[PDB]
Amino acid sequence: LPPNAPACMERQLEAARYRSDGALLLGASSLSGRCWAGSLWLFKDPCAAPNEGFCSAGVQTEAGVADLTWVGERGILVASDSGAVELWELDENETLIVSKFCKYEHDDIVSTVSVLSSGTQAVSGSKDICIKVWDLAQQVVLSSYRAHAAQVTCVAASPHKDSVFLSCSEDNRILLWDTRCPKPASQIGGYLPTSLAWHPQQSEVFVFGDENGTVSLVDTVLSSAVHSQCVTGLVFSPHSVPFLASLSEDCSLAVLDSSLSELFRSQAHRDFVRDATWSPLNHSLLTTVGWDHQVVHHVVPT
Amino acid sequence: RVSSGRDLNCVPEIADTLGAVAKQGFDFLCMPVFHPRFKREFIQEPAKNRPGPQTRSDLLLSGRDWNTLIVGKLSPWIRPDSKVEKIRRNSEAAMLQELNFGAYLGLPAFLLPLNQEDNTNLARVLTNHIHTGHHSSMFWMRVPLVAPEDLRDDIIENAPTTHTEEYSGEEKTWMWWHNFRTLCDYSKRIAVALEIGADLPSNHVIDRWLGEPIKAAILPTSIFLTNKKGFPVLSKMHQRLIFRLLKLEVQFIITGTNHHSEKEFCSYLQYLEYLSQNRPPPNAYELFAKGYEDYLQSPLQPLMDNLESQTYEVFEKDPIKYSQYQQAIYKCLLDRVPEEEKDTNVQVLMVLGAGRGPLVNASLRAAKQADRRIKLYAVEKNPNAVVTLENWQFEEWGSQVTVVSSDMREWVAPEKADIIVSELLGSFADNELSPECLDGAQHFLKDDGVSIPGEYTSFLAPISSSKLYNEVRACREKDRDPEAQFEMPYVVRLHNFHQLSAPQPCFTFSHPNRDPMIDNNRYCTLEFPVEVNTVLHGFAGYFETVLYQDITLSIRPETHSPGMFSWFPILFPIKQPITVREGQTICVRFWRCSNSKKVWYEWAVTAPVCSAIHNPTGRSYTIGL
Ligand SMILES: Cn1ncc(-c2ccc3c(=O)[nH]nc(C[NH3+])c3c2)c1-c1c(F)c(Cl)cc(OC2CC2)c1C#N
Ligand SMILES: CSC[C@H]1O[C@@H](n2cnc3c(N)ncnc32)[C@H](O)[C@@H]1O
């Protein structure tokens, strides 16, 4: 029950991201009921979550948390329902989560956000069809791109190239971006794409899931019918030869290998699976969260 | 006084939100009834068993607030036309659920998007909902002037934007609306919520929406400019569109976040108010008929019917009309009585259809200013108005005026007239049978007598207006032809419509008719060059008349008598709308038919396609002789 931390945590869990030392970051939204808001949480003890009385820190946000991501080791970048991108930062003591800036630049729900290589800039996608490049230090939008014709479903920064990032939209476009080019967007050659994930060890390789439950390996083609519904996210493991965790609206988590073959299957969740994060300490442990308010700790056989 | 609303996709608490919206100066709020991101499963476990509540409780607002302040919005994840079957099923169930919850709350309107070309299933679900209980709730189809794909930044290197003109392509969003409402069989509860983009399209794309049931205009904050002082404003082109939209009295909706953070949020709204205050409506005639806009009226038949007292009052509240008569009589008296005979030559004037006596007085005022002598007859077959005439004659006019309570076709005049004056014209000129009346009265006009008016002509022009088409369509009655409403004309102050070609003359009549073989039947063919893509719903009618020489009356728009209130245009509908492409010609045929009892009109379209002959044998509409 830390200070300025809400007593009750929202039901719908959307984000779960580990950091270097192993503290777990939780993003929650209230998608029903009287008040539709969100919150941010930090669990230095990952097994204590989602219990609010045994968390390291917490804070309430004005609107929901559509997506979030770490910014270093004390920064939290939030995609708000209010159309704003928010940056929160832990104090030196890491007992309070304070709002660093909250800028209302998008005209609709900000659905996706991703931090670039340098860790000083981030790219966000919104239902207003726009994609914006942010200067986290100056708290301003460096660029605003309207390349898509529909909602921007997912934006994923390049792991090591600070000017490159992916994005997919309901206009059926997968766009590879390189802000070094005069025309920075490039359309990469089905069902609507819904999730993106670069390969951590291969520069020009990424994967993307579609609204029909298929995961595809793409060189800048191999695919497999992994889920029976929309593929919500794709997370590679930190291993030298990484595994691929895919979560979907079918309430299941899958773990695939180099050829997109299934090595593990979890159905512990009773609602949508919203995120997945690999432990930096134990590489075989995989944590998932969902709208069933469950924080499951999977032990993936390697 | 602009009725405006605030569009939001994020509402943490309804009470606080609605308060901030009201304090900023808005009349209503567009908000989702279910959380936009709260995707819901309806078929597959375990997700379908998600414990409630599924959304907010209706107790958070009073019934009066739900009825007047809230506009529901369909959740953006609902895609009934998705290519994935599973997503179509869930979207159908979710659409009915959200729509039914809107009806449950008694919301006055619900917002649904038209953001792609195929909305077939979306229309089916909506239509199904409409036929599940009779309700008055409205459905606002959110559709943009310019499809997002057609306004995206040219920043995709391997997929550049189009730089050549695609005339029809730039009208694609209108086709989205047209197909959707046609699938919905022109439901009166389905209106347009036109969304305005940062860059306006060609005029033809904008004109496309002329005559469409536009109930709301959506203005994103990102389209506003910034003047020196830092307040949001609009380009002169956008102001031109806002002015056009105010004439339609649409409700304006402000969407998007505050980008002029230096100023408060009511700033955008203030600009609308400011623009509303800065416009000009022609004296009277736009004051006058603002309440009669697109209001269908049965054409008068002053021959077969006796007009009521207040109907004559309307005729008399138009001084410009009668001063034209006075001048017309004035000029005629001078031309027929030289100065040397001003004391010996008494002219016999006969008002044929005197009503309550505005022409009688106009004749008296004409003789005075002309300094000539006139002997007046006031003929009027409506006995109730003859009561007004004879009280006028005893109290004021005196022996100079002789009231004759008779039909001009049967009256046996004691002498012959030098000038017959009549006001027997309708919106379509001869649609009250002025030719037949003056023909029967022609025998007691001197061989050199003058008739005022001397001639009149009717004009036709093809119009597009899905709004008026729906109003005519709504005129079905219990015990007649289910389509008889399309085979009769209406007097209406045409407002929300689009004139597809310049009016052309149709029927002309001259009086006196010296011809030995008088035949008032008519058959006329007209070809209207149409330079736009549109849909034909009917033909607007006007008329011009020559009172005397250069003195005239006209409701034809290009020659409209300035300042005259009398006579709205007439409307001839057609049963089935007709698609017309740019450059095509609309060929219409009109007949003026008659027997010994009734006169009527028959019309048909022969190009680009053939319509059915309308009102054959006056089956649905006749004018009593
Ligand atoms: C509905 N309707 N149909 C015909 C007429 C009409 C109007 C004005 C004149 C006229 O000044 N002279 N002679 C004639 C006939 N010779 C006349 C006929 C009308 C009509 C009406 F009977 C009434 Cl009561 C009101 C109307 O509109 C007012 C609201 C603006 C109209 C019209 N349009
Ligand atoms: C000012 S509208 C036409 C007027 O002329 C009258 N009227 C129409 N037809 C005749 C007619 N055949 N004989 C006499 N009055 C007529 C009508 O009763 C009405 O008052």
**Cα of A112 vs its chain's centroid, Å:** 7
* Contact yes or no for A198/A190 (Cβ under 8 A): no
CB A288 within 8 A of CB A269: yes
Max CA distance (Å), chain A: 52
Closest residue in B to A131 (Cα–Cα): B153
B582 is in an annotated binding site: no
- What is d(CA B415, CA B543) in angstroms, rounded to the nearest whole number? 32
CA of B355 relative to ligand 1 center, distance in Å: 13
Contacts of A110 by beta carbon, 8 Å cutoff, 6+ apart: A66, A67, A79, A80, A81, A83, A84, A85, A124, A125, A126
Crossing angle for the helix pair B236-247 and B266-277, nearest 10 degrees? 70
Name B501's Cβ contacts closer than 8 Å, sequence gap at least 6: B461, B462, B528, B529, B530, B586
Cα angle: B406, vertex B410, B411; to 5 degrees:
55
Task: Tell if the CB–CB gap between A187 and B156 is shorter than 8 Å.
Answer: yes
Identify the burial level of B513 via C-beta atoms within 10 angstroms of its C-beta, where 0-12 means exposed, 13-18 middle and 19 or more buried. Answer: middle
Measuring from atom 20 of ligand 2, which residue has the nearest CA? B355
CB hemisphere CA count around A280 (13 angstroms): 9
Please indicate if any CB of chain A lies within 8 Å of the CB of B115. yes
Alpha carbon distance B593, B604 (integer Å): 14
Residues of A in contact with B257 (CB under 8 A): 82-84, 104-107
| Rg of chain A (C-alpha set) | 18
Deposited resolution, Å: 2.6
Structure tokens given for B517: 């073989």
Encoding tokens for residue B439? 């023909």
Q: Is the dihedral of CA B611, B614, B617, B620 positive or negative?
A: positive
Q: Is B399 helix (H, G, I), strand (E, B) or coil?
A: helix
User: Rounded CA gap, A123 and A141, in Å?
Assistant: 9
Closest CA to B217 of B240, B262, B182, B249: B249
CB B601 within 8 A of CB B516: no
**Cα B593 to ligand 1 centre (Å):** 23
Q: What is the DSSP string of B471-517?
A: HHHTT--TTS-TTGGGSS-EE-B--S-EE-S--EEEEEEESS---SS
Who's near B305: CB < 8 A, 6+ residues apart?
B624
Q: Is the CB of B570 under 6 A from ligand 2?
A: no
Interface test with B, best of A107, A143, A270, A293 (most B CBs within 10 A): A107
Nearest-5° Cα angle at A124, A122 to A130: 135
CB A235 within 8 A of CB A197: yes
Q: How many helices (H) and strands (E) does chain B have?
A: 15, 26
Q: Could you tell me which chain A residue has the CA closest to the CA of B158?
A: A186
DSSP code of residue B293: B
Q: Give the sheet arrangement for strand A24-29, strand by strand.
A: A12-18, A24-29, A38-43, A57-61
Query: Does the Cβ of B321 fall within 6 Å of ligand 2?
Result: no
The experimental method, as deposited, was: X-ray
**B51 touching A, CB under 8 A?**
no
Q: What are phi and psi of A64, to 5 degrees?
A: -70, 170
**Closest residue in B to A37 (Cα–Cα):** B12
Name the residue facing B55 among A32, A108, A148 (closest C-beta).
Answer: A32
- In the 3-class helix/strand/coil scheme, how is B72-129 assigned residue by residue? EECCCCCCCCCCCHHHHHHHHHHHHHHHHHHHHCCCCEEEEECCCCCCHHHHHHHHHH
Identify whether the C-beta of residue A236 lies closer than 8 Å to the C-beta of residue A257: no
Q: Omega of the bond prior to B453 within 30 degrees of 0, cis?
A: yes
Integer Cα distance of A16 and B509 in angstroms: 85
Q: What sign does the CA torsion over A176, A181, A184, A186 have?
A: negative
Q: What is the CA radius of gyration of chain B?
A: 30
- What is the domain range of residue A255? 1-302
Q: Cβ of B591: how many Cβ atoms within 10 Å?
A: 19
**Nearest 10 degrees: CA dihedral of B394, B396, B399, B402?**
-80
Q: Are A173 and B158 in contact (CB under 8 A)?
A: no
Element (H, E) at B23: helix B14-24
**Site to substitute for ligand 2 among B321, B408, B438, B491, most atoms within 8 A of C-beta:** B408
A29 beta partners: A12, A38
B303, B314, B315: residue to mutate for ligand 1 pocket, most atoms within 8 A of CB: B314
Does residue B47 line the site of ligand 1, with CB under 6 A? no
CB atoms within 10 A of CB B16: 11
B299 touches ligand 2 (CB under 6 Å): no
SS3 B311: helix
Q: Which of B431-435's residues contact partners 24+ apart within 8 Å by CB, and which partners?
A: B431/B299, B431/B458, B431/B489, B431/B570, B431/B601, B431/B623, B432/B299, B432/B300, B432/B301, B432/B302, B432/B303, B432/B623, B433/B303, B433/B599, B433/B623, B433/B625, B434/B509, B435/B509, B435/B511, B435/B513, B435/B520
Rounded (5°) CA angle A121-A126-A127: 175
Distance B127 CA to ligand 2 centre (A): 49
Positions of B marked active-site: 423, 432
Closest CB to A146: pick one of B44, B152, B159: B152
Q: Is there an atom of ligand 2 within 6 Å of B426 CB?
A: no
Total domains in chain A come to: 1
Instruction: Give the C-alpha distances (Å, rounded to integers) separating A217 from B206, B219, B482.
Output: 45, 42, 62
B162 touches chain A (CB under 8 A): no
Q: Is B135:B110 a contact under the CB 8 Å cutoff? A: no
Q: Do B565 and B290 meet the contact criterion of CB atoms below 8 Å apart? A: no
- CB within 8 Å of B234: residues ≥ 6 apart: B223, B224, B225, B242, B271, B275
Distance CA A106, CA B257 (A): 7
Q: What are phi and psi of A122, to 5 degrees?
A: -145, 155
Task: Confirm or reject contact between B124 and chain A (CB < 8 A).
Answer: no
Question: Is A28 in the B-facing interface, judged by CB distances under 8 Å?
Answer: no
Token pair 């004309």: residue: B489
Enter the DSSP assignment of B17: H
- Return d(Cα B307, Cα B282) in angstroms, integer: 30
CB-ligand 1 contact for B171 (6 Å cutoff):
no
The answer for residues whose C-beta is within 8 angstroms of residue B295's C-beta and 6 or more apart is B492, B493
B322 is in an annotated binding site: yes
Distance CA B356, CA B171 (A): 53
Distances (CA, A) of B14 to A166, A228, B18, B109: 37, 36, 6, 17
- Between the two ends of chain B, the Cα-to-Cα distance in Å is 48
Q: Which DSSP category does B614 fall into?
A: B
Report the candidate in B32, B45, B53, B41 with the shortest Cα–Cα distance to residue B98.
B32
From the list B7, B155, B96, the residue with the least C-alpha distance to A127 is B7
Ligand lying nearest the CA atom of residue B380: 2
Helix (H) or strand (E) holding B403: strand B401-404
First to last CA, chain A: 37
CA separation for the pair A100, A40 (Å, rounded): 14
Q: Are the beta carbons of B119 and B81 closer than 8 angstroms? A: yes
The DSSP call for residue B612 is P
Asked if A268 reaches chain B (Cβ–Cβ under 8 Å), the answer is no
CA-to-CA distance for A55 and A34, rounded, in angstroms? 25
Q: Give Cα A167 to chain centroid, integer Å.
A: 13
- Set of chain A residues whose Cβ sits within 8 Å of the Cβ of B55: 32
- Give chain A positions within 8 Å (CB) of B83: 191
Say if CB B139 and CB B181 are below 8 A apart: no
Return all residues near B413 (Cβ < 8 A) that are at least 6 apart: B350, B377, B444
Separation between Cα atoms, residue B222 and residue A144, nearest integer Å: 12
Tokens 């100066």, located at residue:
B25
CB B537 within 8 A of CB B469: yes
CB B496 within 8 A of CB B211: yes
* Burial grade of A193 (CB within 10 A; 0-12, 13-18, 19 or more): buried
Q: Which residues of B touch A211 (CB under 8 A)?
A: 82, 84, 87
> Would you say A111 and A125 are in contact if contact means Cβ atoms under 8 Å apart?
yes
Between β-strands B417-422 and B346-352, what pairing exists: parallel, antiparallel or unpaired? parallel
Q: Which residues of A touch B35 (CB under 8 A)?
A: 31-32, 36, 64
What single-letter DSSP state applies at residue B305?
A: S
Q: Strand, coil or helix: what is B371?
A: coil
Is B165 labeled as ligand-binding?
no
Which tokens is B509 given? Answer: 């009549």
Q: How far is CA A107 from the centre of its chain?
A: 21
For atom 1 of ligand 2, the residue with the nearest CA is B423
In a 10 Å sphere around its CB, with 0-12 CB exposed, 13-18 middle and 19+ buried, how is residue B166 labelled?
exposed
Closest CA to A218 of A261, A176, A182: A176
- C-alpha distance from A238 to closest chain B C-alpha (Å): 30
Q: Which of B374, B510, B498, B381 is nearest to B435 (CA)?
A: B510
CA neighbor of B188 nearest in space, from B215, B216, B207: B215
**What are the structure tokens assigned to B523, written together?**
């058959």
Closest CA to A198 of A111, A114, A301: A114
The reply to whether A151 touches chain B by the CB within 8 Å rule is yes
- DSSP letters spanning chain A: --TT--SS--SEEEEEEE-SS-PEEEEEE--SSS---EEEEEESSGGGTT-GGG-SEEEEESS-EEEEEEETTTEEEEEETTS-EEEEEE-TTSS-EEEEEEE---SS-EEEEEE-TTSSEEEEEETTS-EEEEETTTTEEEEEE---SS-EEEEEE-SS-TTEEEEEETTS-EEEEETTSSS-EEE---PPEEEEEE-SS-TTEEEEEETTSEEEEEE--EEEE--SS-EEEEEE-SSSS--EEEEETTS-EEEE-TTS-EEEEE---SS-EEEEEE-SS-TTEEEEEETT--EEEEE---
Smallest CA separation from ligand 1 atom 31, residue: B567
Token digits of residue B565: 């209130």
Question: Is the CA virtual torsion B259, B261, B265, B271 positive or negative?
Answer: negative
**Per-residue three-class SS string for B515-574:** CCCCCCCEEEEEEEECCCCEEEEEEEEEEEEEEECCEEEECCHHHCCCCCCCCCCEEEEE
Q: Would you say the C-alpha torsion B122, B128, B132, B135 has a positive or negative sign?
A: positive
- B408 annotated as ligand-binding: yes
Angle subtended at Cα A103 by Cα A100 and Cα A106, rounded to the nearest 5 degrees: 145
Angle at B113 between CA B112 and CA B119, to 5 degrees: 100
Ligand 2 neighbour B349 (Cβ under 6 A)? no
B26 among annotated binding-site residues: no
Alpha-carbon dihedral sign for residues B304, B309, B311, B315: positive
Residues 6 or more apart from B396 whose CB is under 8 A from it?
Answer: none
H or E stretch covering B391: helix B383-392
What 3 state SS string does B406-450 have?
CCCCCCCCCCCEEEEEECCCECCEHHHCHHHHHHHHHHHEEEEEE
Tell me whether strands A110-115 and A121-126 are parallel, antiparallel or unpaired. Answer: antiparallel
Q: How far apart are CA B55 and CA B35, in angstroms?
A: 7
CB-CB contact of A232 with A220 (8 Å): no
Pairwise CA distance, residues A40 & A98, whole Å = 10
A168 strand-pairing partners: A154, A174
Longest CA pairwise span in chain B (Å) = 108
Residue nearest to atom 5 of ligand 2 (CA): B353
A211 contacts B82? CB cut-off 8 A: yes
Following DSSP, what letter does each residue of B328-353 receive, concatenated? Answer: HHHHHHHHHS-GGGTTT-EEEEEEES
